Amino acid sequence: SSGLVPRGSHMTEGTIKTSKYEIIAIFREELRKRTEIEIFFNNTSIITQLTRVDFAEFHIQTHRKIPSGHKIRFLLHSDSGKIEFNAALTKHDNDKGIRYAFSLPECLQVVQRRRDPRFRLRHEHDFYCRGRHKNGENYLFDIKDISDGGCALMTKTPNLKFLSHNALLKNAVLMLAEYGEITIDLVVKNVIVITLDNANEESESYYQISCQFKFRHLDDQRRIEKILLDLILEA
Ligand SMILES: Nc1nc2c(ncn2[C@@H]2O[C@@H]3COP(=O)(O)O[C@H]4[C@@H](O)[C@H](n5cnc6c(=O)[nH]c(N)nc65)O[C@@H]4COP(=O)(O)O[C@H]3[C@H]2O)c(=O)[nH]1
Ligand SMILES: Nc1nc2c(ncn2[C@@H]2O[C@@H]3COP(=O)(O)O[C@H]4[C@@H](O)[C@H](n5cnc6c(=O)[nH]c(N)nc65)O[C@@H]4COP(=O)(O)O[C@H]3[C@H]2O)c(=O)[nH]1
């Protein structure tokens, strides 16, 4: 839409990686960046991180007991996109954490559909979105992340009746601290339940509202582009 495409996170609708070397280098970078990994089986997902990686296996550490028999599904929350694969269990021993070892996958799939990178607002930044629903009821949301094309809003107290898919939040106001305020339409793309971590070992539940910007004027888009560049370069 704008042409601006910073390096990192090139789009792919689905790229298959199969080289044992690259698969290892990828696991090593995501263990280091402490990337979130998500583990799915029998209709639910654990969520952990990697503990070590070598040339035949990767290792996690979870209080839950993971099954055995066949390969189970994984999803890495990588800055390159969602990295998915299947891996089988090979070792487990008995903080009462069960050490776990999985064979490295033979192939990974990378999917990166985001045309604009998303900046995650850290506790150094306190941005909000306020507005009025169609019935005049007021709302105020924390902004979790923001990109040239939209944002994710966090709240414990959504009014779900105004948050169906593609519902419009008309004349929301982004409150971006030193950057001022911008009035904007938001199209609701998704609503999920999320567990970020509060301070500090305590994990807490939030609703996450994924939104697309519908700009009022072309200059509002350019203004957001300048804010994101500032955010990225100053952190
Ligand atoms: N309709 C819609 N929903 C959105 C969008 N962005 C986030 N969500 C919802 O928010 C969930 C969490 O997103 P995430 O924390 O960034 O965590 C994501 C993210 O880390 C990653 N991921 C998935 N797809 C992509 C992608 O196309 N690009 C990138 N860079 N990462 C992706 O895998 C994790 C899980 O993905 P999901 O299972 O799909 O789960 C997503 C998804 O349900 C969006 O642009 N449109
Ligand atoms: N900062 C931020 N912006 C958001 C969020 N959700 C939506 N947007 C903005 O709204 C645009 C369109 O969302 P979409 O229709 O669901 O269309 C999305 C969606 O279908 C898909 N996608 C991207 N990431 C994910 C993901 O993590 N999970 C899933 N299930 N789909 C994703 O790729 C399409 C386009 O991605 P985008 O180019 O990034 O384009 C996004 C993005 O600019 C959000 O949680 N945070």
Residue numbers in the entry: -9 to 84, 88 to 228
Recite the paper's sentences:
MrkH is the first characterized c-di-GMP related transcriptional regulator which affects type 3 fimbrial expression in response to cellular c-di-GMP level, and thus plays an important role in the biofilm formation of Klebsiella pneumoniae. MrkH adopts a tandem two-domain structure with a canonical YcgR-N/PilZ proteins-fold, it contains two α-helixes (α1, α2) and 18 β-sheets which formed β-barrel 1 and β-barrel 2. Our size-exclusion chromatography results demonstrate that MrkH forms a stable monomer either in the presence or absence of c-di-GMP. It binds c-di-GMP and also represents a novel DNA binding motif.
Here, we determine the crystal structure of MrkH/c-di-GMP complex at 2.3 Å resolution. The binding of c-di-GMP to MrkH is very similar to Pp4397 - both MrkH and Pp4397 hold tightly two mutually intercalated c-di-GMP molecules, while VCA0042 combines with only one c-di-GMP. Through structure analysis we find that MrkH mainly forms H-bond with two c-di-GMP molecules. The side chains of R107 and R111 also contribute a cation–π interaction with the guanine group of C2E2 and C2E1 respectively. Besides the interactions between protein and ligands, two c-di-GMP molecules are also stabilized by strong base stacking interaction between mutually intercalated guanine groups. R111A mutant almost completely loses the c-di-GMP binding affinity, indicating that R111 is the most important residue for c-di-GMP binding. However, MrkH116-end loses the c-di-GMP binding affinity, which indicates that the connecting loop between two β-barrels is crucial for c-di-GMP binding. A highly positive charged hump consisting of six basic residues (R125, K127, K154, K163, K207 and R209) is identified. Given all these data, we think MrkH has two separate DNA-binding regions, with a smaller one on N-terminal domain and a larger one on PilZ domain. Crystal packing analysis helps us to identify the MrkH dimer in which makes two separated regions merge into a long region suitable for DNA binding.
